[PDB]
């Protein structure tokens, strides 16, 4: 449903269980919603059933509320440093002040932007009011 990743599901299928434990350069997104770029190797061994069915909208969910969750079921969530529970850079699209998409009210965007910048757990990287594109870094998804 717009979900994609790199290496692609069909590529991940070629990896041994040992390789799968340390997938480099893993990226997962949803077109129109955003993207997660992992900063470290990720262990995808839990998802060998079907990378596509496990990852796309179950383990990783980009929602219409302009948010993303990784491991939304607390039973599926490994410790920090394991699985996908590792540092990542995230871009979310169409993120706007309250839903106030009017760029002519620039002062209001500046208030919102300062709120984004003050976030403790979603460490600000950038925010572009023309499109509502918010980029930030997380240390994990606990």
PDB file of N, CA, C and O in Angstrom, residues 12 18 26 45-46 51 71 73 77 92 132:
ATOM      1  N   UNK A  12      15.929  -9.607   0.018  1.00  0.00           N
ATOM      2  CA  UNK A  12      16.237 -10.069   1.372  1.00  0.00           C
ATOM      3  C   UNK A  12      16.135 -11.619   1.427  1.00  0.00           C
ATOM      4  O   UNK A  12      16.847 -12.279   2.178  1.00  0.00           O
ATOM      5  N   UNK A  18      22.442 -16.046   8.832  1.00  0.00           N
ATOM      6  CA  UNK A  18      23.547 -15.265   9.410  1.00  0.00           C
ATOM      7  C   UNK A  18      23.632 -13.831   8.841  1.00  0.00           C
ATOM      8  O   UNK A  18      23.859 -12.893   9.586  1.00  0.00           O
ATOM      9  N   UNK A  26      19.728  -0.598   5.596  1.00  0.00           N
ATOM     10  CA  UNK A  26      18.301  -0.891   5.488  1.00  0.00           C
ATOM     11  C   UNK A  26      17.507   0.408   5.542  1.00  0.00           C
ATOM     12  O   UNK A  26      17.746   1.261   6.398  1.00  0.00           O
ATOM     13  N   UNK A  45      15.988 -11.358  11.046  1.00  0.00           N
ATOM     14  CA  UNK A  45      15.721 -12.815  11.173  1.00  0.00           C
ATOM     15  C   UNK A  45      14.319 -13.145  11.697  1.00  0.00           C
ATOM     16  O   UNK A  45      13.750 -14.172  11.333  1.00  0.00           O
ATOM     17  N   UNK A  46      13.703 -12.252  12.461  1.00  0.00           N
ATOM     18  CA  UNK A  46      12.338 -12.478  12.892  1.00  0.00           C
ATOM     19  C   UNK A  46      11.303 -12.453  11.773  1.00  0.00           C
ATOM     20  O   UNK A  46      10.163 -12.815  12.023  1.00  0.00           O
ATOM     21  N   UNK A  51       8.894 -11.093   4.360  1.00  0.00           N
ATOM     22  CA  UNK A  51       9.406  -9.760   4.651  1.00  0.00           C
ATOM     23  C   UNK A  51       8.317  -8.756   4.360  1.00  0.00           C
ATOM     24  O   UNK A  51       7.946  -7.946   5.219  1.00  0.00           O
ATOM     25  N   UNK A  71       7.260  -1.695  15.688  1.00  0.00           N
ATOM     26  CA  UNK A  71       6.882  -2.652  16.761  1.00  0.00           C
ATOM     27  C   UNK A  71       5.714  -2.142  17.572  1.00  0.00           C
ATOM     28  O   UNK A  71       5.841  -1.957  18.741  1.00  0.00           O
ATOM     29  N   UNK A  73       3.173  -3.745  18.528  1.00  0.00           N
ATOM     30  CA  UNK A  73       2.814  -4.821  19.503  1.00  0.00           C
ATOM     31  C   UNK A  73       3.983  -5.029  20.433  1.00  0.00           C
ATOM     32  O   UNK A  73       5.053  -5.481  20.011  1.00  0.00           O
ATOM     33  N   UNK A  77       8.536  -6.694  20.336  1.00  0.00           N
ATOM     34  CA  UNK A  77       9.565  -5.652  20.403  1.00  0.00           C
ATOM     35  C   UNK A  77      10.805  -6.120  21.100  1.00  0.00           C
ATOM     36  O   UNK A  77      10.790  -6.348  22.282  1.00  0.00           O
ATOM     37  N   UNK A  92       9.063  12.354   7.982  1.00  0.00           N
ATOM     38  CA  UNK A  92       7.598  12.259   7.885  1.00  0.00           C
ATOM     39  C   UNK A  92       7.108  13.414   7.014  1.00  0.00           C
ATOM     40  O   UNK A  92       7.588  14.543   7.173  1.00  0.00           O
ATOM     41  N   UNK A 132       5.501  20.276   4.627  1.00  0.00           N
ATOM     42  CA  UNK A 132       5.444  19.744   5.971  1.00  0.00           C
ATOM     43  C   UNK A 132       6.394  18.575   6.209  1.00  0.00           C
ATOM     44  O   UNK A 132       6.005  17.585   6.833  1.00  0.00           O
TER      45      UNK A 132
END
